[model samples]
Target: ATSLKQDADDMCMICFTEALSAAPAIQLDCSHIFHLQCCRRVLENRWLGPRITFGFISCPICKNKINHIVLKDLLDPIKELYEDVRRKALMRLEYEGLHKSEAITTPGVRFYNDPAGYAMNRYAYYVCYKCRKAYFGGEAGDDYDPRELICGACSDVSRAQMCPKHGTDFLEYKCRYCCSVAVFFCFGTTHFCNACHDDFQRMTSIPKEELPHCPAGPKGKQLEGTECPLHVVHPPTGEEFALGCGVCRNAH
Candidate 1:
């Protein structure tokens, strides 16, 4: 559930006027990038930093004039807000999750029993206000149950976890220097890192003499099968960086 919120960063940064959420921060002469929260602190705080420019605001990076060669337009109205619209909705659902030993509250609960042995509390079970489907909170489950009711009008049967429905799966490449997920690719034979300017030859090229595990086989055949050598996953961030085939943006 939290992972869904992470995708919002790509959306918030790349999204134009039609989609704006996070505050923007432009890189200064040094081109050191940071979030608005970091930049705003430098501009507002007078005790810890030097005051400069017309209104006493210094460039967070070099302490020079705020005007620079490049200015990235930023309009993040919800910078200080801890949670956004999407994160809040997801958090609400997660909080509703019950513990294994938790007990359902019964307060004047309604029940129905008929002579035919077929009956239900017209309002006892939870009726998804979003969907007309009814479910019992009293029922135990091996996993967390979603509150969303799936009906003809609210069902999303097209959703998929992986495979063709999710399109091609790519490889992730991390910057050996910065340890950051650089980029990803599906086709081709070379992986590039834009930040570190390092280009790693694909399965086609020879790996370093010292580090040889044979991630692939003869003529581009992957000796490891489903596992790819270029599919480098970031453990701390859980972000997957894909290595593109061909001389991409060198990610050394």
Candidate 2:
């Protein structure tokens, strides 16, 4: 939800895709914009290209000093966790000789050999759907399953959430952008925030030619409908860029 359909040059450099997650678009101190999710993935040394040694890294776009800009703030609490994982990984690699830890004397049994993979799995990001709190939930070489998207605080309710506005338990959805009560459903899956609904209604009164063309395909394409999933009215003659849209048709 909250997918960003923008120019290719305007997309996140790392993923080569628009915003598809709730981490939000992050503008680094260097003024380079990227999805926070992409930025964090790079910092965690989760990329396949090169190994990022501790205390050393650069921006994926221009190689500018990363400065621990956005990630330090987001993973502030989990900073110690990385070091702790690294130490454990080192100990496992040294004493265990690429297999089970020292105490496990099953003999001829080879456990997972990738220390980095183990660490990343341990600090994996988990989101609490209700309050929108992002958290970490790693396992100790064991499988994990849960009934719902959860965080430490919202773990009290595994199936549903309590609604403060209605003063009761409700199945209502909040806007993907603002986290307010959703007033519109579009794109087959996303629910628009209450604030988003107003933009669709109020701006819809504008003239068609005044808005921008759909940027879906290589060149500009004509639009089909006035309604949009993001809740903003594009130039109707250049509308939602849906199935009937020239942009979508040409791209496929």
What are the per-residue Cα lDDT tens digits for candidate 2 across 1-252?
764344435657778756434347776776666787777776664323111133324666666745446577645534554555465444433332433433334444332454544444333333345554333322221122222434333432223333343222113333333312233344344433323433644334445464434321111223455433333333333232112111111221
For candidate 2, what's the RMSD? 20.8
Q: Across residues 57-131, which tens digit of lDDT does each residue of candidate 1 receive?
A: 444335454433332222132222212322322322233332111122233333121211111211112233344
Scored by TM-score, the top model is 2
- TM-score attained by model 1: 0.18
Whole-model alpha-carbon lDDT for candidate 2: 0.40
TM-score of each: 0.18, 0.24
lDDT (C-alpha, whole model) for all candidates? 0.28, 0.40
lDDT accuracy of residue 141 in candidate 2: 10
Q: In terms of TM-score, how similar is model 2 to the real structure?
A: 0.24
**Candidate 2 backbone collisions, by pair:** 175-193, 223-239, 235-238
Report the Cα lDDT for candidate 1: 0.28
